[PDB]
Amino acid sequence: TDKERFIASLMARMSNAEKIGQLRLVSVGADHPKEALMADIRAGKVGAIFNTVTRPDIRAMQDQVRHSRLKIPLFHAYDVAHGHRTIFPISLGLAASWDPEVVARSARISALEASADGLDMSFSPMVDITRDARWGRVSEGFGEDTYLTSLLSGVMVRAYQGSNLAAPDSIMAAVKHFALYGAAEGGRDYNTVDMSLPRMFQDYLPPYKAAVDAGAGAVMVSLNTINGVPATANRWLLTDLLRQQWGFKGLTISNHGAVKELIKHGLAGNERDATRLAIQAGVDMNMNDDLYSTWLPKLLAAGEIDQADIDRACRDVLAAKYDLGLFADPYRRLGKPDDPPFDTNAESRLHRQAAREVAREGLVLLKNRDGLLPLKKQGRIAVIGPLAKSQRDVIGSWSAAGVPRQAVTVYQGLANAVGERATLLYAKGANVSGDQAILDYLNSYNPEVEVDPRSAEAMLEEALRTARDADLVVAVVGESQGMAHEASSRTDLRIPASQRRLLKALKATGKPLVLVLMNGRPLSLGWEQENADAILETWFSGTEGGNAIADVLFGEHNPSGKLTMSFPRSVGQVPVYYNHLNTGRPMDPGKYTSRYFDEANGPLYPFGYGLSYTEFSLSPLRLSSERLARGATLEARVTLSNSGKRAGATVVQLYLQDPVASLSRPVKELRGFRKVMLEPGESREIVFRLGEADLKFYDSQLRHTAEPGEFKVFVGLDSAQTESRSFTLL
Amino acid sequence: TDKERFIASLMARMSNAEKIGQLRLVSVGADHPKEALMADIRAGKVGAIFNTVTRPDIRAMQDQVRHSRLKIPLFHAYDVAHGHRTIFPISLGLAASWDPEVVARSARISALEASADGLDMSFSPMVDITRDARWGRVSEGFGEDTYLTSLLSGVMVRAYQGSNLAAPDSIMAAVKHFALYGAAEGGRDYNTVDMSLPRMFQDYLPPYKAAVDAGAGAVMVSLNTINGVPATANRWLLTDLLRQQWGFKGLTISNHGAVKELIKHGLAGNERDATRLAIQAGVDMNMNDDLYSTWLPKLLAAGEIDQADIDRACRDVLAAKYDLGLFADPYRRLGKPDDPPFDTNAESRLHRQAAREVAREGLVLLKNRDGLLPLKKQGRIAVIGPLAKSQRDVIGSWSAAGVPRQAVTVYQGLANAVGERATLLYAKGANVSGDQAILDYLNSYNPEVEVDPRSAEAMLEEALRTARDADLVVAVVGESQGMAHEASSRTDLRIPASQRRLLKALKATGKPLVLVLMNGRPLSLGWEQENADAILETWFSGTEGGNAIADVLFGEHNPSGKLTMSFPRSVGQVPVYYNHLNTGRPMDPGKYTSRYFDEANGPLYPFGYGLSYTEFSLSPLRLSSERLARGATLEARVTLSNSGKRAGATVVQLYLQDPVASLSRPVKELRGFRKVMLEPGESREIVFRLGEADLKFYDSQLRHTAEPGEFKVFVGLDSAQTESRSFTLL
Ligand SMILES: OC[C@H]1O[C@@H](O)[C@H](O)[C@@H](O)[C@@H]1O
């Protein structure tokens, strides 16, 4: 009420020019020259900035606020996706930890580092569910499962904001992308999303909800159509659901030019009508295109919008700036004016031990034939592949203020680990792609892919020599970061062809072969799974990537990471995901069942799959009672044992099935998990509690109710577990 | 009244045992031995038969009806998909004609032939819209566009039934599959369908509606879930939409065991509860599984169903049998008991001139480099490929009572054409697949593909010899019919690997190359499009396939056929189709648009694409008026000229765009077309009439309304190349 009183007072004093100015979100570029945007903050025509990210630069613009009548402060935002200056695994990587704390840790440091440079807000977390591997931004998300993505969506918000949004070591979480962006048609970015309302509520919205429940201060609106309505103009989404059904009190922010793009969507004839549609749907902040500033004065002066529309928008900005504390101290995150200069990129502001301890948790052991891993630090080891010495690629897509040169490549990481106890032979082995059209694309803007000018065959001879000169080969292969990024959708899911040639040749030398994969999406790995001797999924593991990868290769860390997005046998099985419906004709032999004929059926690697240097056993699953009363809770009991001879971590998973329902329900749904560290011979009893809240689903009219009847409870170390116990709900 | 009085009388007379008996649709098998089901028709426990298809066999069972108390007659049904005994192109083939009367002709003869053998009903037409090329049953449909599929869906019903359903040369049309079956997830048959209701009404339902509007006597319910509800138990679909919104008076028929499959869908705990769900949703007839007969007596005796449920079902059967005339004369289609047994498969009952004149219309010219086609009948010609001499493959999937040996292969068709005026060299060149697992599948049940036991390399040397010995090669390559059928979903869209090797080799001999393709779905043809000198798409062209194909190869017919389903550049661009939404970031090149980076963008061949031995010109498009009044119609005027040097057919197509709408509308939609035969130098003015009815779409609340504003009118010879003019609706 103190806040409402303060805001109302200020708004009662503001001209319309000034209330509309508060909605203008810009960045420095050719669109907005810095010296023209400085003049505009002075005349009170700007509301916030993004992509300005250093203390002297934020201060230099904040310092313009004083020349304006109402002296209203800016906030600054940035794409703090998976790190500011120290870069953690890409989010898909982080998810594979199966540990909130680990994810939380990555978030806190990001905020710490961002706030340290003067940043008020991160456009993060990206929380979009993804079941189509072809999509360029699958990297940014946490995988295919609702339960886990929703869970981690909250953890990220809580960590960024903490308990006080005005704390100078806290940033506001602008959760994205609202909504359904990840279900785009054909995995083409920006493409049509068409979905039933029961699937919309059960599977794809819950993560956006959990961000509002954790108190996210802002929401970024997606670029996709929903059932034919662009989210930028979707009053159902931004008003009915977000505001009234969900009670979001915060700020809505447009995507980059998403308001003028209503012309290309075919919802507006021109800019004037695009502005109207967006402001009236529930869009507070207008990113970059400046439509709001050009058209809202004439839209109001001709009675096409209500003052109440401008007022709800302008009031949502000031409420953000107030919660951040920028009305108390505009410089609360920019230091005091005497304070001494410093180097922004100094090694002394990084958090390497953090980056390294996180990146360890997310690596996934896909194959290890006859205990080849872990490697000993003796003899000669060949390091071949175009990503071995790649700095720019390990820190993945959306790297923020991340610097390539400060990054530990997987070559350097191997050097650091062996010291002088073994020898490393390096050969590039292949460029990342043989296709010049693909190379032209990745280097259109900035040189981010190394092109070795030597013939492909030249590089291959060198590699085979190097391999014959070694005890075993370690192959650093897969995508450059520019391949799993915004607008970079793929029609193939295998390792690029130039590198698969390299892998065929290396296989032909008979020397044991270890595959180290870098990638921002699942990959088609049918060949590699039958040929190569061991495979490590390392995603893009960040600034301490190489170090974390070495630790796992040399057994300093027993890999514990597991898949949160099923691995297709080819681009032509898309989509596959663990929580599909059984259909009327399930494949279990049989020609006349739901299947392909021309390839094996199922995902290559199921959801929740990962190996360990040690072996684990689960005892028979016990349920407290076989009939549950309404309001009561149920207990699921199982003993996890490390029966191998190495201290290692697994992830014990709880799946539910509702086998008889008013809807057709998935064969399996994730409902809980416990990440457990055990010494050899060490047991550990795990306890799962199951309430009514766990048993609910959205029927045809969105009635969110548990139905009485049998339920199936599954406990195992991956979704490929197939034995359960049953209880009856009364 | 006569009918109502007759039915009411009979029903007032029937015990429950007998009214339930009327719902039992069975066929002869291990489920139902012939001599046990004979005993059952005598105790009045059977209602209809399917898959019994010869006069003596139908008579032998009809003849059992006399020993029953109420002497109620059976009807007999069969899968008359694209022919009974004379087999026309597969439906996708038929569609490519762009001529209703041609399609009508195929339908009439089918009915003629079917009724001749004693058949009352065909489970046809299949009318499901298909945008996913991987799906096994794409062959059965008419392609991806709503307007064209809806149009032909009615033509098929009208032709099967004629003007009188009791006529002994008419059958009843059971339209399928209701509903949305073709949008299955990942192209996997029987798999989940999830769709928004605005896209459901605009794009996928209209063809089922057009069949009810043409007076279809029956409707078959699909096996797919819709937004989580199995259609077999979907009261919204079978009662609200079908009965009360649409006013369907007729009969609903289950898919094969689709009622017991509600257990595997996860809607029912057991059979008893599956029966209840289905009978109460709107399912009259129970195909094969016999659940209705086992459970309806106890479901009614315990008040789980209403007598009104049994009565609505039993009344819908008798209404069908009455309309067919089987109460007037049970043998009206089974002759008088005087004639000789006669041979069913006699040459004198076929319709070859029909089959040949249809199959000509459906062939599509995809490429012709420097007028290589048409061929002269004047030298040596190599005929290579595993489908050149293939009888079983030309008559495609769902060939009914069709006989392979009566069919004209593409080899034989070429022999017939050249007589002794030119010389034919044959080499198989490759089996249809190199993969033994694929060959094992296609020959699981019946020997459908003859496998040459020689090594792949052996066959290839033979082919290259044959090719070197000739003036040019004609290659008969693509799918066996077992590859485009129910349950046969593909992960690849190219010609099988064994045959692509064969085509690379043949290309390498320098000899001019003609590709004759056989296939039941679009195919990935990027290589063939850049290499081969000409390509002909022949689908599976039926009993007179070879003859029709020769006629086109030797210029006896100028190819006029055009594509009704866009051709993907690879399985990884699925789905593509001409009537997609523009999105906010359209590509036509930028990086940040809705696209792939690792392949060229767009379909290989767009919807409505086909070439000709002659060339055609369209004059500037003229509109009747700049501004249309409500209730008024508009005229669209264009002059088509054959400016080439041969008499040929093209197809002039009318596309509409609504560029500003409450919904995001497709970039282009089909609204009309005119197939025009022209002599060289010969012109023809075409007139298109455009009403408000043409400009409607389903908004977010299913308001079927045209909005005032600009509309874009496009006329051209394919969805790709075009010119447009704009008009305003007031
Ligand atoms: O770069 C700022 C913003 O640009 C938008 O177009 C992207 O969709 C967002 O993920 C991003 O936060």
Ligand SMILES: OC[C@H]1O[C@@H](O)[C@H](O)[C@@H](O)[C@@H]1O
């Ligand atoms: O117009 C292109 C813009 O689109 C945004 O979504 C991208 O994230 C920006 O980096 C880019 O400048």
Ligand SMILES: OC[C@H]1O[C@@H](O)[C@H](O)[C@@H](O)[C@@H]1O
């Ligand atoms: O063959 C009888 C019927 O069986 C069903 O299960 C198929 O899906 C239909 O296509 C067919 O008409």
Ligand SMILES: OC[C@H]1O[C@@H](O)[C@H](O)[C@@H](O)[C@@H]1O
């Ligand atoms: O699965 C049993 C039956 O199902 C039908 O849909 C298929 O078309 C038949 O070939 C098969 O006999």
Ligand SMILES: [Mg+2]
């Ligand atoms: Mg239940």
Ligand SMILES: [Mg+2]
């Ligand atoms: Mg309009």
